[PDB]
């Protein structure tokens, strides 16, 4: 089981926002051009659901609205089918029988022939499948073979939707690395739920995430994590983006912990505008099975100096070493160049680190500006 500091760092990510619904472009505009704006799409979702309910009830206007929506949806679907058929015909016309090929992944420079093993990664373009496939690259691979081991699948959907309105956003990601000796299986799933919309109430969203990790030969143990987060806007004002989350982590051999080490954490997140300061805060507390760790992150901005960015972090171990960190960032434009500076100060170790990045695209004036290391470099025998 990882230390409580890792869990406290995971929980204190910052201000969060769950993913909303997805909307079709043909149905929303009834065959007309539309633009992008949130609040007007979830309104369309809930409005069409309510109008369907009222039409079932018997209101003639709801029936008329639903009939118009159905006509627009049918026209859009037929148009898309015709477009798909035309695209397939055009693809057949261009290449008579030859399926389209894909560009191989470029690994980089090496003493082996750079053009070698390119034929292995050049495959025919796949069909319009829902899943997405990505290759995973290991740190060190075989000397005389390709260094790509394993694969990862990514999938997204919005099921339980009627005519493109409503549904439950759902994301899945599975990384699988299987060989004759080892086995690495990492799965993650996200589910979104919406309770109300600004026209019909407040913005109430609940996100449930579940991630499990299995490493068969090395660890021989599996890990499960389940987190539920609730977000609501304007709890103590016009807009505060209040959020509260609860996470449970288990390291049992299988299924239930069965005496496995458990951990429970809770996090709170809120942003507030006081005077000239727009402060965003996220504070979490985690307890493993019996030390307890605390974490807090804050982002502070000053409207009179928009170029300066200030972040504060406070981490407390079990009672009780408190680590405080302050980070400041600034940017400016030099003569034909841009310089960005970052200062990080830690009081636990009493240390200050200053980094200045420089980019010049007009000439090499900055190169002639800095020449000390050349003289500083000595043979020394």
């Amino acid at each position: 089981l990882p230390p409580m500091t890792f869990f406290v760092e995971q929980m204190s990510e910052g201000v969060l926002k769950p993913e909303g619904w997805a909307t079709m472009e043909t149905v929303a505009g009834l065959g007309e051009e539309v633009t992008e704006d949130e609040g007007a799409e979830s309104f369309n979702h809930v409005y069409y659901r309510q109008m369907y309910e009222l039409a079932v009830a018997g209101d003639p206007w709801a029936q008329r609205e639903y009939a118009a929506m159905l006509r627009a949806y049918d026209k859009g679907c037929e148009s898309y089918r015709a477009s798909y058929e035309e695209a397939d015909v055009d693809a057949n016309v261009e290449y008579g029988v030859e399926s389209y090929v894909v560009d191989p992944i470029d690994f980089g420079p090496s003493f082996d022939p750079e053009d070698m093993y390119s034929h292995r990664h050049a495959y025919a373009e796949a069909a319009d499948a829902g899943v997405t496939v990505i290759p995973s690259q290991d740190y060190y691979g075989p000397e005389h073979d390709d260094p790509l081991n394993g694969i990862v699948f990514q999938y997204e959907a919005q099921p339980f939707s009627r005519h493109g309105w409503g549904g439950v956003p759902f994301d899945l990601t599975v990384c699988c690395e299987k060989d004759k000796t080892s086995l690495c299986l990492q799965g993650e799933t996200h589910v979104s739920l919406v309770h109300s919309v600004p026209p019909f109430g407040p913005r109430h969203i609940t996100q449930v995430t579940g991630s499990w990790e299995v490493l068969r030969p090395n660890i021989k143990d599996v890990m499960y994590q389940l987190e539920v987060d609730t977000f609501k806007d304007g709890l103590l004002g016009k807009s505060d983006h209040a959020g509260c989350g609860l996470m449970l982590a288990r390291l049992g051999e299988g299924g239930d912990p069965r005496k496995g080490p458990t951990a429970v954490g809770v996090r709170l997140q809120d942003t507030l505008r006081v005077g000239p300061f727009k402060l965003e805060a996220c504070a979490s507390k985690v307890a493993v099975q019996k030390e307890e760790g605390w974490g807090a992150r804050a982002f502070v901005g000053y409207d009179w100096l928009p170029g300066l960015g200030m972040a504060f972090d406070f981490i407390q171990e079990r009672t009780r070493l408190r680590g405080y960190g302050a980070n400041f960032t600034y940017d400016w434009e030099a003569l034909g160049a841009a310089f960005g500076m970052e200062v990080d100060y830690v009081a636990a170790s009493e240390s200050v680190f200053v980094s200045v990045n420089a980019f010049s695209g007009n000439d090499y004036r900055l190169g002639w500006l800095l020449l000390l290391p050349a003289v500083n470099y000595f043979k020394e025998t």
Binding site: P202, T230, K232, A242, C244, V266, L268
Partner: peptide
């Protein structure tokens, strides 16, 4: 700090669930 954090979390959860 543990008691304050737990109380704040419980109060926030209750307030969010009430609405």
């Amino acid at each position: 700090a543990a008691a304050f954090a737990a109380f704040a979390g419980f109060a926030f959860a209750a307030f969010a669930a009430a609405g």
